[PDB]
mmCIF file of C-alpha atoms and ligand atoms in Angstrom:
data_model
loop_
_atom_site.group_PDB
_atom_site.id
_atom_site.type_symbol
_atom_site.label_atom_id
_atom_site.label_comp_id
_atom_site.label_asym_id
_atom_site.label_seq_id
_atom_site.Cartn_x
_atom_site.Cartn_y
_atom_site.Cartn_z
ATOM 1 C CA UNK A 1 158.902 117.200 27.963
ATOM 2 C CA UNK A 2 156.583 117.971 31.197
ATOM 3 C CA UNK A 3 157.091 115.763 33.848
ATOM 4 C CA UNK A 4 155.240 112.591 34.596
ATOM 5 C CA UNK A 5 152.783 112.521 37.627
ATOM 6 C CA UNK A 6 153.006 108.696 38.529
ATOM 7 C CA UNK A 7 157.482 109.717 38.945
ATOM 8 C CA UNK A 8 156.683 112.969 40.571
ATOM 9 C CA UNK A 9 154.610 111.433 43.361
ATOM 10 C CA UNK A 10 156.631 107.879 43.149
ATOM 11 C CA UNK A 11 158.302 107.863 46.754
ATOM 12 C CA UNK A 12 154.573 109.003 47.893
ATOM 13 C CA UNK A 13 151.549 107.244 46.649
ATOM 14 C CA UNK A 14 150.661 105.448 43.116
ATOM 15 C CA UNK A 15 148.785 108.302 40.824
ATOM 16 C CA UNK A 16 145.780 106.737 39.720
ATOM 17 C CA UNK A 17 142.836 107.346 37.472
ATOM 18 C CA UNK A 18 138.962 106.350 36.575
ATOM 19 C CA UNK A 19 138.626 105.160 32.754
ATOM 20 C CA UNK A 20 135.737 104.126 30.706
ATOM 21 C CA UNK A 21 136.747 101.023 28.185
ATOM 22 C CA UNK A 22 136.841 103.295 25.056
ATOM 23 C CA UNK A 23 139.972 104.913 25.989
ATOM 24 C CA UNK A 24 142.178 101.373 25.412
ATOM 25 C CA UNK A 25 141.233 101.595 21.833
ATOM 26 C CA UNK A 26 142.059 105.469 21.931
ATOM 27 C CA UNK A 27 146.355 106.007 21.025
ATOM 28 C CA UNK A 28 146.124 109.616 22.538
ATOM 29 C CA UNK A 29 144.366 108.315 25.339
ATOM 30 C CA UNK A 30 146.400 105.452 25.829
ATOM 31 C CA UNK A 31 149.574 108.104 25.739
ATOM 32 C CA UNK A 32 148.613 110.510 28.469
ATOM 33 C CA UNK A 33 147.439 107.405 30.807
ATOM 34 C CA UNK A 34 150.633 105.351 30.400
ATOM 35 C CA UNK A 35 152.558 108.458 30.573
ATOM 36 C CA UNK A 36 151.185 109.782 34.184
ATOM 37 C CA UNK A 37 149.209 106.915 35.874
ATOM 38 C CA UNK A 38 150.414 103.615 37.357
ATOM 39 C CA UNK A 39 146.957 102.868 38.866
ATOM 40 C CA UNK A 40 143.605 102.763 37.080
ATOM 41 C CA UNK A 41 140.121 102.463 38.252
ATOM 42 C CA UNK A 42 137.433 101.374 35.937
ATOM 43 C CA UNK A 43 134.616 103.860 36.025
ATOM 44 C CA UNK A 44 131.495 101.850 35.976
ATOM 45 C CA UNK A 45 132.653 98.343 33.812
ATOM 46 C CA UNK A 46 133.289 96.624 37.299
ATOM 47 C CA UNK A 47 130.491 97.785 39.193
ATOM 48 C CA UNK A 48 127.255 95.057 40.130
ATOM 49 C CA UNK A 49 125.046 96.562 37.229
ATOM 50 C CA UNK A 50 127.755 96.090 35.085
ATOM 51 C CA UNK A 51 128.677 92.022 35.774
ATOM 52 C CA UNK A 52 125.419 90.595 36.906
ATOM 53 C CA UNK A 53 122.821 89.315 33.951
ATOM 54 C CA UNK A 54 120.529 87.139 33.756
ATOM 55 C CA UNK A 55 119.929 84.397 31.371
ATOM 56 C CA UNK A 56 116.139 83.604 29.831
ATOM 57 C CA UNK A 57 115.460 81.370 32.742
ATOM 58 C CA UNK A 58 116.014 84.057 35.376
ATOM 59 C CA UNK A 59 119.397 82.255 36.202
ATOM 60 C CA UNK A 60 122.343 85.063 37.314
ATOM 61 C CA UNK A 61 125.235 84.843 35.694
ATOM 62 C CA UNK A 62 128.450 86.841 35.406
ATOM 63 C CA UNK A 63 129.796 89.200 32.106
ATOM 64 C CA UNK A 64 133.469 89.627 32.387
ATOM 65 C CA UNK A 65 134.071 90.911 28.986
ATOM 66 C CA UNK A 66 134.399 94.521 29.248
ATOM 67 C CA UNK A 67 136.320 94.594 32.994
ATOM 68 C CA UNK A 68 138.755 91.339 31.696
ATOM 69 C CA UNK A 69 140.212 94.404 29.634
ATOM 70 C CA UNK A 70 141.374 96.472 32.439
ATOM 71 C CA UNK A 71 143.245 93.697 33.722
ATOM 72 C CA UNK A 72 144.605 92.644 30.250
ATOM 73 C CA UNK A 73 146.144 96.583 29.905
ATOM 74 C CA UNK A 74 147.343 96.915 33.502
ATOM 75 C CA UNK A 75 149.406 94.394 32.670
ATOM 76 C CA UNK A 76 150.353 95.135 29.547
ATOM 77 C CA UNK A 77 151.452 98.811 31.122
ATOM 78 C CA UNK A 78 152.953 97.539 34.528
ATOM 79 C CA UNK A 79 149.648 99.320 36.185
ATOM 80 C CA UNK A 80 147.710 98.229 39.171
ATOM 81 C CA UNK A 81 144.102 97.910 39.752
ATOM 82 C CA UNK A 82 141.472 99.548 41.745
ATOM 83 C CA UNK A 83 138.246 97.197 41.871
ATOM 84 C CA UNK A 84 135.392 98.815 42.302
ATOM 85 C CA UNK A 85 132.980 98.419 43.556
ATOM 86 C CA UNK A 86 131.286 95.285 45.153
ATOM 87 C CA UNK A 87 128.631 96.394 47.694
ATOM 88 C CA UNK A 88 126.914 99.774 46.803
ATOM 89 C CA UNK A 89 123.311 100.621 47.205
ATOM 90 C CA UNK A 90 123.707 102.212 43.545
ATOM 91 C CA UNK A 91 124.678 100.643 40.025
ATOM 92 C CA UNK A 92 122.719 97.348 41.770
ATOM 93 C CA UNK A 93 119.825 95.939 39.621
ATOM 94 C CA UNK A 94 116.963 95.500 42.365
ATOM 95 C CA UNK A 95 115.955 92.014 40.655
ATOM 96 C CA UNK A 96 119.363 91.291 42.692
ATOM 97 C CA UNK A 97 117.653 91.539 45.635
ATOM 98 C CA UNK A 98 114.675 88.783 44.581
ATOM 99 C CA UNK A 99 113.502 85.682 43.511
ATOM 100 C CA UNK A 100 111.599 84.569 40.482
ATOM 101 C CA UNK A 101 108.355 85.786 41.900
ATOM 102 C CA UNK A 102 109.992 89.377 42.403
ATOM 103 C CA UNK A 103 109.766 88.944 46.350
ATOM 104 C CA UNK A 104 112.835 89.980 49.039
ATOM 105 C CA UNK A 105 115.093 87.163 49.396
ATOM 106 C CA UNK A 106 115.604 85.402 53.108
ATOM 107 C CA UNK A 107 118.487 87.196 54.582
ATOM 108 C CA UNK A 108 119.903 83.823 54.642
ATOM 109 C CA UNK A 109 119.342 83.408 50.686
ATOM 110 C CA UNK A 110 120.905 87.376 50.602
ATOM 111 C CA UNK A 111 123.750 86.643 52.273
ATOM 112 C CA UNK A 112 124.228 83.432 50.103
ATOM 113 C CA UNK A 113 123.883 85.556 46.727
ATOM 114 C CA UNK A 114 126.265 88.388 48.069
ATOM 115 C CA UNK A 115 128.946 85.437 49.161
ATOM 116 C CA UNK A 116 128.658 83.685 45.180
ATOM 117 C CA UNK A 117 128.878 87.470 43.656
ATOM 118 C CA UNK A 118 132.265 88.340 45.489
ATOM 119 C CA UNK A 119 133.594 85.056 45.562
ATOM 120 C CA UNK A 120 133.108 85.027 41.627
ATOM 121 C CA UNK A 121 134.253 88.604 41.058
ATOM 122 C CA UNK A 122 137.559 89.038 43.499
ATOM 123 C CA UNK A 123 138.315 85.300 43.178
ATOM 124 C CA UNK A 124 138.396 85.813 39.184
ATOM 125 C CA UNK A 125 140.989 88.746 39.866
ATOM 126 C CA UNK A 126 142.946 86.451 42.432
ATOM 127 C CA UNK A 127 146.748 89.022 42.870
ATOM 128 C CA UNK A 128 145.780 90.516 39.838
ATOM 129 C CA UNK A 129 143.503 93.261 40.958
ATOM 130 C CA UNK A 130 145.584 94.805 44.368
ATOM 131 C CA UNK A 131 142.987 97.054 46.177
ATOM 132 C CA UNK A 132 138.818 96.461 46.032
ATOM 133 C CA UNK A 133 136.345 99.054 46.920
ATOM 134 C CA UNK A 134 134.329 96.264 48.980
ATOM 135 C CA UNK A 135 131.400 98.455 50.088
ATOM 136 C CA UNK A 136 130.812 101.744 48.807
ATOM 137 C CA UNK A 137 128.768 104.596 50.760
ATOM 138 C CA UNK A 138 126.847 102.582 53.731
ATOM 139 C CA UNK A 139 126.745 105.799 55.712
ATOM 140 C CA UNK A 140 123.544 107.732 56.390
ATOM 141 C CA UNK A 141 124.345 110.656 59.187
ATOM 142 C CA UNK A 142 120.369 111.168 59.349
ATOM 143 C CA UNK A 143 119.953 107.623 60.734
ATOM 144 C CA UNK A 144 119.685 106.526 64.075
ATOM 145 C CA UNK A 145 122.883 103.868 63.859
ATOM 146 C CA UNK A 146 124.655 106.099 61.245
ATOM 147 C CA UNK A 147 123.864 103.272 58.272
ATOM 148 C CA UNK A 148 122.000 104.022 54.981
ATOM 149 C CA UNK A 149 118.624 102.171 54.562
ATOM 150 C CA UNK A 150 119.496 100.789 51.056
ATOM 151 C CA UNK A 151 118.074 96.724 49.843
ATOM 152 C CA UNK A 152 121.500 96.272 51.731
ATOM 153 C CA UNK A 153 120.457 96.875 55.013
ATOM 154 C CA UNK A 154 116.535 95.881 54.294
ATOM 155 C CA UNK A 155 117.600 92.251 52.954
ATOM 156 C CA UNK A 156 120.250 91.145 55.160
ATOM 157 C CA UNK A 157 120.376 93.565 57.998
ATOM 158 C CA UNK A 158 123.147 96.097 59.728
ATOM 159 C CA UNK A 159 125.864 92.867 59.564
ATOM 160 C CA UNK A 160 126.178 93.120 55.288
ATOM 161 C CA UNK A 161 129.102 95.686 55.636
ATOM 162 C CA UNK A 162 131.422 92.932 58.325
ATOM 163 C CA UNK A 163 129.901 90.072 55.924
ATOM 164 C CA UNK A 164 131.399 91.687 52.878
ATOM 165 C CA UNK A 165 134.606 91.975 53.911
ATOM 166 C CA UNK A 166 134.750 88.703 55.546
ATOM 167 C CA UNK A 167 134.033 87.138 52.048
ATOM 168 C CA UNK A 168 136.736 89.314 50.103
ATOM 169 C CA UNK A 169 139.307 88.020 52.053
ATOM 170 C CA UNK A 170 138.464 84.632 51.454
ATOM 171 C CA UNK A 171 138.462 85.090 47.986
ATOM 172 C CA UNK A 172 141.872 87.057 47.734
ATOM 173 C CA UNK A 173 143.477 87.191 51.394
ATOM 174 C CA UNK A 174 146.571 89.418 49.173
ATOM 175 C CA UNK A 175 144.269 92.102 48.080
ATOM 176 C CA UNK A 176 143.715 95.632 50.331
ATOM 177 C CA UNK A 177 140.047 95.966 51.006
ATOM 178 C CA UNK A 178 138.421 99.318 51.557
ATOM 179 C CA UNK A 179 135.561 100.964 53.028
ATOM 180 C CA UNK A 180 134.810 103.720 50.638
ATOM 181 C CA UNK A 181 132.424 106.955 51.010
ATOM 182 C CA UNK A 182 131.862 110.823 50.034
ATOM 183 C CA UNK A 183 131.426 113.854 52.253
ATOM 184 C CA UNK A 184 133.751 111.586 54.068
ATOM 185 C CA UNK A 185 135.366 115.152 55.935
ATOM 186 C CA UNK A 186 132.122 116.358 56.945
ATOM 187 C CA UNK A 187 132.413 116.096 60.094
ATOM 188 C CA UNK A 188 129.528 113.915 61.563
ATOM 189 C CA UNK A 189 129.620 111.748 58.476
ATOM 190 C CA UNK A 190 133.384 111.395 59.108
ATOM 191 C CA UNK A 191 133.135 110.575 63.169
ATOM 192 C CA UNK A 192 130.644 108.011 61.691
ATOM 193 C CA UNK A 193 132.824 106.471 59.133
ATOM 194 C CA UNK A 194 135.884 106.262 61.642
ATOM 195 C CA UNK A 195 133.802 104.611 64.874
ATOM 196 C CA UNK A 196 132.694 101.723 61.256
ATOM 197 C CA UNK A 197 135.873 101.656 60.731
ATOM 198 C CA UNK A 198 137.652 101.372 64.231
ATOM 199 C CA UNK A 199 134.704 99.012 65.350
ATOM 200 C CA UNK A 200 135.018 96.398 62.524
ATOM 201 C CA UNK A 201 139.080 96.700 62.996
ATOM 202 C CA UNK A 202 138.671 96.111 66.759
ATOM 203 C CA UNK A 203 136.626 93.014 65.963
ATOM 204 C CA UNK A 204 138.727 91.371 63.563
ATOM 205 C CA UNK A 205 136.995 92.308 60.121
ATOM 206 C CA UNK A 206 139.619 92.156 57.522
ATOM 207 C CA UNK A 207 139.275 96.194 56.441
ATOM 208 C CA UNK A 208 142.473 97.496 55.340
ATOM 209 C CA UNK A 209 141.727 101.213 54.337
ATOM 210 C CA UNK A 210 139.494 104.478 54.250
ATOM 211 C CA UNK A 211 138.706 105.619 50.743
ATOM 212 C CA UNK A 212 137.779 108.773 50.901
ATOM 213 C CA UNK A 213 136.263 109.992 47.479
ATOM 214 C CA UNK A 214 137.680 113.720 47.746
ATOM 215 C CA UNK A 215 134.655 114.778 45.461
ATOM 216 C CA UNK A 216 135.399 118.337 45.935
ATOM 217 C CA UNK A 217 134.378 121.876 44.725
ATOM 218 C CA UNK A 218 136.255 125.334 44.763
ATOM 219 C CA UNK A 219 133.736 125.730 48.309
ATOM 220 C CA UNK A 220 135.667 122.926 50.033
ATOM 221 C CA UNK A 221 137.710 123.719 53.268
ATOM 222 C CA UNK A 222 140.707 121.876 52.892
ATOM 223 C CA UNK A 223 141.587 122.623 56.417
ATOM 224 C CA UNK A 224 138.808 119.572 57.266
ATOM 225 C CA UNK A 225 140.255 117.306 54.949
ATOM 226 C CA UNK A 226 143.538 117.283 56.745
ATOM 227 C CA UNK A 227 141.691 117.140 60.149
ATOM 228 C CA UNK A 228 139.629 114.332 58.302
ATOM 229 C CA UNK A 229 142.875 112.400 57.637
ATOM 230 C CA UNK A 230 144.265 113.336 60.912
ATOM 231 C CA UNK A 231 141.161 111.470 62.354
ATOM 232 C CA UNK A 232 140.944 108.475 60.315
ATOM 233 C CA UNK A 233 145.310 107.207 60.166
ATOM 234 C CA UNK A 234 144.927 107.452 64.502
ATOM 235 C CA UNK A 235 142.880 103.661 63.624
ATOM 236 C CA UNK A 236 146.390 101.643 63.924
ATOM 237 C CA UNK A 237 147.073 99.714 60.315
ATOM 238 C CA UNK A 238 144.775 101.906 58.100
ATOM 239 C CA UNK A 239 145.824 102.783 54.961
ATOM 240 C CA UNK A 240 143.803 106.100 53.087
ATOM 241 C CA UNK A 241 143.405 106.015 49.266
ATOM 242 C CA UNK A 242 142.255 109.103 48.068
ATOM 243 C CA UNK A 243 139.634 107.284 45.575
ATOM 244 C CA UNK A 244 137.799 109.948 43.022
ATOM 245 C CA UNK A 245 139.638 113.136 43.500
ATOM 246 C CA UNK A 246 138.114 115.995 41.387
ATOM 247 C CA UNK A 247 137.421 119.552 41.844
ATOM 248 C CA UNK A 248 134.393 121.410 40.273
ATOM 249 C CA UNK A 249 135.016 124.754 39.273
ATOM 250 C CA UNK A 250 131.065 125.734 41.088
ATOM 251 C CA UNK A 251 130.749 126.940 44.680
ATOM 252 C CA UNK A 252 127.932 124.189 44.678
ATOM 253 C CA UNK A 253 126.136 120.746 42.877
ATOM 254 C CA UNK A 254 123.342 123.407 41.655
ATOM 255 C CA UNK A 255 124.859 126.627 40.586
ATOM 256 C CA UNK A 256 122.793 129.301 38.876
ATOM 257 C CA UNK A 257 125.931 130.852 36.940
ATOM 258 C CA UNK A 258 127.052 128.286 34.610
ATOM 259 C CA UNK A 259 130.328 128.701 31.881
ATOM 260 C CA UNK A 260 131.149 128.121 28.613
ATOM 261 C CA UNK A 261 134.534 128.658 28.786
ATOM 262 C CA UNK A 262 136.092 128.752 32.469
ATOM 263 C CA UNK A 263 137.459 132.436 33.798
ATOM 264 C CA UNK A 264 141.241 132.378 33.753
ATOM 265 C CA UNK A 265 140.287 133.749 37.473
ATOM 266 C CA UNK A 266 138.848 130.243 38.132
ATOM 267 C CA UNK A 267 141.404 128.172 36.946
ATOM 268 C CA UNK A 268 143.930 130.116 38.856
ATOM 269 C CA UNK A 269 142.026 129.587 42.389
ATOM 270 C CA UNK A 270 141.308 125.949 40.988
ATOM 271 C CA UNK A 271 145.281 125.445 41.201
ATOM 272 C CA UNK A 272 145.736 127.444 44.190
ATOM 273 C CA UNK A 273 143.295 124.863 46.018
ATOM 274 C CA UNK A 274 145.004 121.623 44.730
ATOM 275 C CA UNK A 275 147.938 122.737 45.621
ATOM 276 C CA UNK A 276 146.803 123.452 49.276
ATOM 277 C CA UNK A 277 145.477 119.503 48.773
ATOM 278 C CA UNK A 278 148.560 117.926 47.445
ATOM 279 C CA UNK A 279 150.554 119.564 50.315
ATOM 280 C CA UNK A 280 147.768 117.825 53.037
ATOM 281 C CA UNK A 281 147.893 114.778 50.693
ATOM 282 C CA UNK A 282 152.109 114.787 51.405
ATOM 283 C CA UNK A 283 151.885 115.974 54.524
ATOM 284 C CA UNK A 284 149.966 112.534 55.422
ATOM 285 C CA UNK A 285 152.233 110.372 53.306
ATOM 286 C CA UNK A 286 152.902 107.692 55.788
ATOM 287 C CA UNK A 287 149.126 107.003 55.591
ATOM 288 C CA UNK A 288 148.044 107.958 52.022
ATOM 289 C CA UNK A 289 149.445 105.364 49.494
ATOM 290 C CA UNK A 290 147.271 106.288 45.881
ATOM 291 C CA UNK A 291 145.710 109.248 45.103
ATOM 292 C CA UNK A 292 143.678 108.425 42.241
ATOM 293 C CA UNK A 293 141.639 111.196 39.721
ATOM 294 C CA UNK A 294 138.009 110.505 38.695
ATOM 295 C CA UNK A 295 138.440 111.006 35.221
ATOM 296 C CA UNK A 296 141.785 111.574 32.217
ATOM 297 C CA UNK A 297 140.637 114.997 31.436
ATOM 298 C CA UNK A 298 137.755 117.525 31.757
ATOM 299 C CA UNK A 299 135.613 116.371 29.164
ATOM 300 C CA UNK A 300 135.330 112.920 30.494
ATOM 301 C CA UNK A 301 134.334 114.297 33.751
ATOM 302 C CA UNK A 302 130.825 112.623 35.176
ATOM 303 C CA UNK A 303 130.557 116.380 36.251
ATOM 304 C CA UNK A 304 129.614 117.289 33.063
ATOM 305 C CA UNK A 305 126.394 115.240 33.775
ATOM 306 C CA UNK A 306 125.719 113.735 37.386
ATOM 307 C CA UNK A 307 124.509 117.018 38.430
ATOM 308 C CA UNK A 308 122.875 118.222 35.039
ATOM 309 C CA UNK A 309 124.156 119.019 31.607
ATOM 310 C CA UNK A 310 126.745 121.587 31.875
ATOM 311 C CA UNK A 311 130.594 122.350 31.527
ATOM 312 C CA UNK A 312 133.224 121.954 34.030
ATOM 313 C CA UNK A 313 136.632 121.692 34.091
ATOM 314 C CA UNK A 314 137.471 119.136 37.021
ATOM 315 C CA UNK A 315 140.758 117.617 36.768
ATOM 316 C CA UNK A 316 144.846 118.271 35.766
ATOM 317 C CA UNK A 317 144.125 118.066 31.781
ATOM 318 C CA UNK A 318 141.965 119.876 29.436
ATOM 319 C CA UNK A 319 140.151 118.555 26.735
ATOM 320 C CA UNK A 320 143.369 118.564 24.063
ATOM 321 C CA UNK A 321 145.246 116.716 26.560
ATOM 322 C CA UNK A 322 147.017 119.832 27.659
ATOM 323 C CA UNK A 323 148.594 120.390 31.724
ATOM 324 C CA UNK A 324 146.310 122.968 33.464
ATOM 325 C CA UNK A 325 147.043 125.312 35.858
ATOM 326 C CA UNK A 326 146.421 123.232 38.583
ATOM 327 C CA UNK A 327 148.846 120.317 36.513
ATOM 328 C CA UNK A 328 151.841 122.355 37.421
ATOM 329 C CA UNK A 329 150.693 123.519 40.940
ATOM 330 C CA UNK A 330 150.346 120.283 42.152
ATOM 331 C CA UNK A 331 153.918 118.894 40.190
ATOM 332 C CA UNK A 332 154.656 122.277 42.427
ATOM 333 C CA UNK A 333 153.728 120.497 45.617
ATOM 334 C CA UNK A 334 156.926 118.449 45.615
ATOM 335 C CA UNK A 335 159.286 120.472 43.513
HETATM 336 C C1 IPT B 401 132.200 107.793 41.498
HETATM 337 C C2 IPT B 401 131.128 108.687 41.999
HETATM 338 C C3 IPT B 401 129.977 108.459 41.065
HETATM 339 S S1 IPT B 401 130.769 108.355 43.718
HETATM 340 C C4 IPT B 401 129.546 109.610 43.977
HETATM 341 O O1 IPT B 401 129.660 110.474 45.116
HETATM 342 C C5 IPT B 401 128.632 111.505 44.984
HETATM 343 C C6 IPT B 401 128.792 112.677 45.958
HETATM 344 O O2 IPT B 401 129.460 113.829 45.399
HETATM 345 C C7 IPT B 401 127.235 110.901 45.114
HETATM 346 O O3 IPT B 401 127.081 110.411 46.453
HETATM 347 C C8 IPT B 401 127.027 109.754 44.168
HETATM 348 O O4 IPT B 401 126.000 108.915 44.707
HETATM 349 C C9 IPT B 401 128.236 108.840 44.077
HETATM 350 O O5 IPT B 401 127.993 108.012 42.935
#
């Protein structure tokens, strides 16, 4: 009876959304996803620490159990499939990073291990999985060069980002491959993320897209989002996926008033500012092709932990499935 985001937003971008495994086995779950979404990211089953084991021997191998089952309902559901993420400096076991003896790999040996892991994980997904995450958050504004000192860059050097790429699109030269990062409208971490992006174009890397996490909070200026955008679709062939869209109902990550229950004031300016997105997010429609949530409803949100124990209320559906405020504002966007 209320319209369905994925057909609202059809002639503009797939509606997507972040899912831990538990919700295949859950019906109501299972009804508001296949009802609204026609993309799906899994939340944390396909990132590095999630794959990678080790056997007795201290011999990696490779657990596709858990992220197999993404690809087994997207299929089932006629839904595509985010993959994330392949290179992060997070959600990485540091053993990764060594040998036996718990030393730093050669860069050579690095770059070796890093070519095996996303051979095996985006060749196993071969035009199955449409659109990887192939390095997550390499930017570091207080750096000299603009690039976060993670094992990454210690290990194999400022050339892992190009590398990464390179070896996605041998493994599946169908899939769109994106850089992905927060604060990403910030606007000396975004001038760094478009001269990455625009540099590694210019030289031939096969990078397809910006994914810009739009991890936001009722502080946000949406004003530099759409300059953000503005900036980034000027790199000729880009395509934007908004990634991990959420808005926090604080004014910060650390706020000393905390709810119980959110003001009706709150969710009313909480709707007010995604509508003011969604019209930016249409406005940029020849760029933007998925805009995907990070999270089915509030009290799945990684908001209600990340930044300590406490309530929010970050995304389109409550906690008994039920359209927010800011669920009809944004259906408002179009209509
Ligand atoms: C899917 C999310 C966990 S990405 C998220 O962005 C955050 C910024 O708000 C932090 O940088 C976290 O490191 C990062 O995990």
């Amino acid at each position: 009876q209320i319209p369905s985001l994925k057909d609202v937003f059809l002639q503009d971008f797939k509606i997507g959304v972040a899912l831990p495994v538990r919700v295949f086995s859950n019906s109501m779950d299972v009804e508001l996803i296949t009802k609204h979404f026609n993309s799906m990211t899994a939340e944390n089953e396909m990132k590095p620490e999630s794959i990678l084991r080790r056997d007795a021997s201290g011999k990696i191998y490779y657990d596709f159990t858990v992220a197999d089952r993404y690809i087994e309902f997207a299929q089932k559901h006629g839904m595509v499939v985010r993959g994330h993420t392949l290179v992060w400096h997070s959600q990485t076991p540091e053993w990764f990073f060594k040998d036996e003896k718990g030393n730093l790999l050669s860069r050579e040996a690095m770059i070796e291990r890093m070519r095996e892991y996303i051979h095996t994980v985006v060749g196993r997904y071969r035009g199955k999985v449409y659109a990887w995450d192939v390095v997550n958050e390499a930017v570091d504004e207080n750096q000299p060069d603009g690039l976060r000192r993670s094992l990454w860059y210690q290990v194999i050097g400022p050339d892992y980002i190009e590398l990464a790429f390179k070896f996605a699109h041998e493994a599946d030269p169908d899939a769109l491959l994106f850089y992905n990062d927060y604060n990403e409208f910030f606007p000396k971490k975004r001038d760094i993320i478009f001269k990455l992006v625009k540099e590694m174009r210019e030289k031939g890397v096969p990078i397809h897209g910006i994914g810009m996490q739009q991890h936001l909070t009722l502080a946000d200026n949406v004003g530099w989002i759409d300059i953000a955008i503005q900036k980034f679709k000027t790199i000729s062939g880009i395509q934007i996926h908004i990634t991990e869209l959420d808005v926090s109902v604080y004014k910060s990550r650390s706020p000393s008033i905390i709810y119980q229950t959110p003001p009706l004031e709150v969710l009313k300016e909480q709707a007010e500012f995604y509508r003011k997105l969604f019209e930016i997010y249409r406005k940029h429609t020849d760029v933007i092709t998925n805009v995907t949530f990070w999270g089915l409803k509030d009290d799945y949100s990684w908001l209600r932990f990340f930044f300590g124990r406490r309530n929010d209320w970050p995304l389109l559906f409550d906690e008994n499935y039920q359209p927010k405020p800011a669920f009809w504002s944004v259906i408002e966007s179009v209509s």
